[PDB]
Amino acid sequence: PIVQNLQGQMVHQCISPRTLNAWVKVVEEKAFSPEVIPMFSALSCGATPQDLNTMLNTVGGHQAAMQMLKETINEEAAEWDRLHPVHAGPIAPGQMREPRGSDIAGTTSTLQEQIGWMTHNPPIPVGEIYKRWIILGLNKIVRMYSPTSILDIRQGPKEPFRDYVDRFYKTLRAEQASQEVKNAATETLLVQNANPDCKTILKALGPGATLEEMMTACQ
Amino acid sequence: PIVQNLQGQMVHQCISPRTLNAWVKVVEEKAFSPEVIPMFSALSCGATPQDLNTMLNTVGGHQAAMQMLKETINEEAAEWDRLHPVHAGPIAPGQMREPRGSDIAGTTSTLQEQIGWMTHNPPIPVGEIYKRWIILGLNKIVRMYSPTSILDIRQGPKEPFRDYVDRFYKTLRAEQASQEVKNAATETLLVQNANPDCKTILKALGPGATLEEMMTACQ
Amino acid sequence: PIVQNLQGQMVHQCISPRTLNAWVKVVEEKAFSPEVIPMFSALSCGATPQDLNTMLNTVGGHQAAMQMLKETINEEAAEWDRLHPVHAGPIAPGQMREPRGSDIAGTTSTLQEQIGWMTHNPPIPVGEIYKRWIILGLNKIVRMYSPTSILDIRQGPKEPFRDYVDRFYKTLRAEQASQEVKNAATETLLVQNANPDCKTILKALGPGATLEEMMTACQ
Amino acid sequence: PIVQNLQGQMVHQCISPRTLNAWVKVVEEKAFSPEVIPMFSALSCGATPQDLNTMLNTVGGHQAAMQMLKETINEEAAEWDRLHPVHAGPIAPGQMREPRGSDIAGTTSTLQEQIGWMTHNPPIPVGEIYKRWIILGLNKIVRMYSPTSILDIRQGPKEPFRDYVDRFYKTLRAEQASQEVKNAATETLLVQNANPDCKTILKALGPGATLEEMMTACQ
Amino acid sequence: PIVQNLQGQMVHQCISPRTLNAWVKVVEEKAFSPEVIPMFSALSCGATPQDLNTMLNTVGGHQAAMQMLKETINEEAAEWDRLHPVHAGPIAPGQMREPRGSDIAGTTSTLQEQIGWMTHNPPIPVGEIYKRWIILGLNKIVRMYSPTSILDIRQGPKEPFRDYVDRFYKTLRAEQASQEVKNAATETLLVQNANPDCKTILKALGPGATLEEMMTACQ
Amino acid sequence: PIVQNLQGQMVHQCISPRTLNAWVKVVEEKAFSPEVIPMFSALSCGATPQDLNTMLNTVGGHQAAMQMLKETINEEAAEWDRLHPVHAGPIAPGQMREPRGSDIAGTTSTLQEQIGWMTHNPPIPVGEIYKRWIILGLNKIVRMYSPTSILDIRQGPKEPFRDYVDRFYKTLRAEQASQEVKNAATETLLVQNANPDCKTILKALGPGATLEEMMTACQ
């Protein structure tokens, strides 16, 4: 990654063993559960494109997912190239060349070039650009691997309401419902899919009930 | 987080793998037992709003709780906006814009803006403001998930007094009794809910007994 | 805590995840065995009052003990206030206010105030003052939770002498005998409570025997 | 390794215990699964040739592989010597000698010489040169230890499509198919080797289907 | 401990959680096996007397040993006081007082005084002095807890010679034989205590055999 | 060890708990398997003689090996003294004395002297000299503890060739065959000791086959 030292200049540091191991293990333990994404983003704070490739490449399973991710990355790279075409022909001696999609994705750029872009004034933030493409890809994967439709999350006759809501919102997160929909579901699908007893209590609370109020009601 | 380097300027550091892992694991092991809150506060020492979101987002279960927390955060954000309305229309070139509720909660502000606020002279402490909202939310959750009323904590006939008081005060903490009430209960509910034998000893000590004195008495 | 950076000024650092975890785990594993106290003292080296509260608050069990500790802290705070009354009425603009008991215990003071006191020239060492109160409290707890009187530590007929002395001194430590008494017991209670065979050997060594000499004798 | 200190000069640091242990353990757990290579590359970020030898030498098993790697390294060294012959006869007093193949591989050069080369202006990057030779060798090993031809990866009658694609791409990675071939296989061998039911669905999608589309289709 | 910062002045650092935990665990796992001593010495590199007390106090078992150690420390302290008597009466304002035995052992000196002594020019190395007393004490303990005389280490009829020599030298180390005796035993007791078969081979090698030669002979 | 700080001067640092623990554990787990040696060398990067003694002394078993190592060290020390005799009689006030063998081995020199030698301009590298003696000793031990002659490594009738070559080269490493012999064995003993079926294939490849070619052939 690129970090500020204790004196305030932006320099390259090696990715740490603790970072490498954290990411491998989270993938091992959680696969593409949705909370893996924010972990990825945090573990790659300051990453160069080289670093981002390192983290993805150190993953041993999930190779169907990694191939899908490559496809997504190529799509975004191709759109970058449409928006930001680069000059063919030789570089001005000693000067910074402009990055193409494949330079952002780290496949045609050197570590030195990446550093040069990211520490330019002002920065050409190739690490952040590539990270956004990667996350775009990873979210598609999360959605793909989500095993259950929200329509099939229904409260069991003996299932505590709390346990049911946990299942409901865990499913909506993986299915990647917007926050509008997450904020709205509380007045609709969450009640409809509740068991008869709690459905009756919830119906009676009336509209505009907070989730806290609904959960208290069905305790 | 924002830290002082070894030379005394306030700079942004990446959230560490050890921090990320600590929080995930405490949640995994303790859920919303009350001691989780002070751990959260300590693990997020110096956090930006981005960092606070990271820590909350890396939590994989408890999604009913995380939705309730969003609701709390929106409420506080809306109150911030009532108290501190911001100018519509374009920013003075190169100048710091004022933060709205959603900028404090990190949903409409960039990391760079957050840093700018938090390292201004004097600071607009957006990390601390958002942390307070989050903790407000988390305490509601603790109270919600508290499984037992203090009225149902009664000393067993063979239950050592110490074990009973531990249960009593653990329950009061989760139910979020004030310190007035915690300091007062020792002369009332704690005696009433004791077993017959210890109740008799405690009754005889007379009023004004310390908890240490009560515990010694029923040893 | 407050630390010296690599350049020699006194600055605030976040309490580390390793520190937080160390303390929680020592409490989990050892409860209020006496060696917990020196661990507490070492883990809170440089602590502000905020830090000390953090460490105590992160403890999930032992709530009877934590309530007793609050009582002790209030007692010491009240004695501080008797010895060092503070001016009512408004603070001199920009100047340091004097700390009350509850400011030392971190309940009415901000982190910024605490830092200001502790890094004043010369320091008002609020972290060390509060730590002493806490330890005073913790020692009471150790003594309370000590399960056995020294009078009931007697050497078994087949019990190796070494194992017996270990039990003896472990018990005296928890019961909080002075070092005078620890240094004296070797000529008295330790012999009296030994088994017949070793009692005879010890009696014959005569007075002024070191513990090393006594232990060699009964090997 | 050679690192930038907090002041911006290039200096030698000892290889860390965490690094040493990481590499030994990844080899212990994964042998020459393909994801071991990018881990090696990341764990040896900034390595001198001495460091690279350390990491290889600390491996206790896999000695057939380590012998094959020596052979590869000798081959590359011999090609370096063909391209970059060095002056026989004595060194200019106080001046930097040019590196031979065996100096790059760390077998005839001292740590001091290695440092001198790598921190020259401009650097003679002996660590990166040797790392490339090592990786060249390691990839041969991965391919050698790959247990299954891609022709034998066929979807089971009850095998979920996702699980089959994971097997397929894991195998192609170890067999070291190019990215052209990985990007192409999706329209050919992957369909042919699918089970009858999914083969029919895939055939009907038509050509130009993304892997995401294929995977959705056979869900 | 007292350390050199990154700028070259001698300053006080907090004892680390990793250090505290290392020592507790080595004692837990190895008790007073002889190799515990060099671990103690290394873990307390740079220690103040306060730090040394911390490490000893954090030990929960072995209280007979800790009492014996106190006795040893008092003996050395008393000898220090005989050799280096201090002026009674008040300290020169602002000046360094001379350390008594109990100031070296950290029982009558403050951390600030300890630091003042240890960073004086030239240093009064109170940490190293106290460490020597402690080690003197610990060696007595090792010897006390050594379970077997060297006279009872005899090679079994089916016991490999190597395993026998390991037992022999492990025992001599705990019994604290000098290096003269360790270097000499190879020509005497080690042969005498060997089994008949290896005794015959060893006898025939003749005098002046190295341990390597003896071990090869009885392989 | 002696390290470069973040400002570029050579200073003494305490050996870390992580280093101490790494070495003890590698010895516990691997004994004197050959890969232990390069681990030792790496873990003692920058070591003073004091540090080297620490690492050796913290080893609790293998005392026959540690005695043999002492003997080796005395031999090298005695040869140093033959080559580099030192002046008897008093040191020039304030000046650096020359190191004898026992000063290099850390038995008659102080830490301060060691530091003085190692940070002299130019350095008298006593840490590296002693490390070489130690490694010389350790290699003898590896060879001694090697359980099997290369003549007894023969391929089983159902033993995969790869598994056989691993056994072969693991044995040659412990027996400490030169690289000439390791590079040569592939055309001789490795074929002769192969099973009949693979022996026939190998014989037919003809001379000059790489190990990669041989291994492919017998797959």
Ligand SMILES: Cc1ccc(Cn2c(=O)c(=O)[nH]c3ccccc32)cc1
């Ligand atoms: C066809 C294509 C698309 C995108 C990439 C980017 N990329 C790398 O360069 C790399 O080393 N590993 C990667 C792992 C997983 C996804 C993309 C990776 C490569 C090839």
Ligand SMILES: Cc1ccc(Cn2c(=O)c(=O)[nH]c3ccccc32)cc1
């Ligand atoms: C409707 C609404 C309210 C509050 C927030 C703040 N927030 C984030 O921005 C985020 O990334 N994760 C969060 C996790 C748990 C609670 C609030 C989070 C978002 C949306």
Ligand SMILES: Cc1ccc(Cn2c(=O)c(=O)[nH]c3ccccc32)cc1
């Ligand atoms: C009545 C009373 C007495 C003392 C304290 C001090 N104190 C805190 O402020 C805190 O946050 N946690 C604490 C945990 C355990 C003991 C005292 C704590 C609070 C209340």
Ligand SMILES: Cc1ccc(Cn2c(=O)c(=O)[nH]c3ccccc32)cc1
């Ligand atoms: C014949 C030959 C070729 C290459 C090398 C390079 N090399 C080292 O120097 C070393 O110490 N360990 C190594 C481990 C595994 C591969 C090559 C190593 C040595 C000998």
Ligand SMILES: Cc1ccc(Cn2c(=O)c(=O)[nH]c3ccccc32)cc1
């Ligand atoms: C009578 C006497 C002798 C020596 C000491 C020194 N000492 C401490 O001060 C301490 O806090 N813990 C200690 C643990 C184990 C041995 C000596 C310790 C105290 C008392």
Ligand SMILES: Cc1ccc(Cn2c(=O)c(=O)[nH]c3ccccc32)cc1
């Ligand atoms: C007779 C003799 C030879 C060599 C040494 C060097 N040496 C130490 O000084 C030490 O403290 N531990 C050591 C452990 C294992 C080998 C040599 C050690 C001492 C004595």
